[PDB]
Design a binder for this molecule. Structure first.
Ligand SMILES: *[C@@H]1O[C@H](CO)[C@@H](O)[C@H](O)[C@H]1NC(C)=O
Lengths: 49, 238
């Protein structure tokens, strides 16, 4: 389960290969479902499968 | 410590200014190759953006219609700030936003502002802007936005929350805002807790600036393959 500084849901965690611009903390796919997230404290991108 | 110039330059509060594709990122969400429809306050494209001459300092208190955009083009960073609130005459609180000591400093309080406020310049001083303040609500400090370079900002106040987004590029044309796509990055987010219906500009004295207004319209933001915005449409402008 997740609660990343308010972002919640469920999934399997693996490292992401999606880069975020300084403007964004979280990303979404086609149909707007959250996939990749930036860790609230660590500047790395994590994928929620 | 005010200079007592009270220049009171008298020019109409209007200007033809070509302006297009000036948006801010509405969220912190990254989308690849997605056209995003967002309903928020943005400056309508080709809307009235008033250009004010300055030191003879043209700086009337102007209406804040939902929110505003500001921009200026000066190498020395002579314009140092903005003042926002219902009256700006010490009867209500206002938001004093300044740029000095290579940082951005914001204070929300009831300030005894001078009719033609200047930052002192050496030692710098805020007392040439206002003599005192009381009944204070909030303070905020952030990184400088400095880099003739153009500094474009959007100022919003939603239910007591104040936001600034900005973009900085070199500019050759200073008679009009530059054209082309520009998306602004968030700089501040404050619980100021006040009514902004009016605003005024703060200038350092040894200066001209643009100001527009926002409307609650749908914008189509065209996102690129890696989440940046490359274009924009102002819904029902024409
Ligand atoms: C702004 O309004 C004034 C009215 O005095 C007009 O002359 C000017 O063309 C307008 N500018 C734009 C960009 O609409």
């Amino acid at each position: 389960n997740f609660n990343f500084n308010g972002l919640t849901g469920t999934g399997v965690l693996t490292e992401s290969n999606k880069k975020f611009l300084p403007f964004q903390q979280f990303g979404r796919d086609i149909a707007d479902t959250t996939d990749a997230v930036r860790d609230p404290q660590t500047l790395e991108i994590l994928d929620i499968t | 410590q005010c200079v007592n110039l009270t220049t009171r330059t008298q020019l109409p509060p209007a200007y033809t200014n070509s302006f297009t594709r000036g948006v801010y990122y509405p969220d912190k969400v990254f989308r690849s190759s997605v056209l995003h429809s967002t309903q928020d306050l943005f400056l309508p494209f080709f809307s009235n953006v008033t250009w004010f001459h300055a030191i003879r300092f043209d700086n009337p208190v102007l209406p804040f219609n939902d929110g505003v955009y500001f921009a200026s083009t000066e190498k020395s960073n002579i314009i140092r700030g903005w003042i926002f609130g219902t009256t700006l005459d010490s009867k209500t609180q206002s938001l004093l936003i300044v740029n000095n000591a290579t940082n951005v400093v914001i204070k929300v309080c009831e300030f005894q502002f001078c009719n033609d406020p200047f930052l002192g310049v050496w030692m710098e001083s805020e007392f040439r802007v206002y003599s005192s303040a009381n009944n204070c609500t909030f303070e905020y400090v952030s990184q400088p936005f400095l880099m003739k370079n153009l500094r474009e900002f959007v100022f919003k106040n939603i239910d007591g929350y104040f936001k600034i987004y900005s973009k900085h590029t070199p500019i050759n044309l200073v008679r009009d805002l530059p054209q082309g796509f520009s998306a602004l990055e968030p700089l501040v987010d404050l619980p100021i807790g006040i009514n902004i219906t009016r605003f005024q500009t703060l200038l350092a004295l040894h200066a001209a600036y643009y100001v527009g207004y926002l409307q609650p319209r749908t914008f189509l933001l065209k996102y690129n393959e890696n989440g940046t915005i490359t274009d924009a449409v102002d819904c029902a402008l024409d």
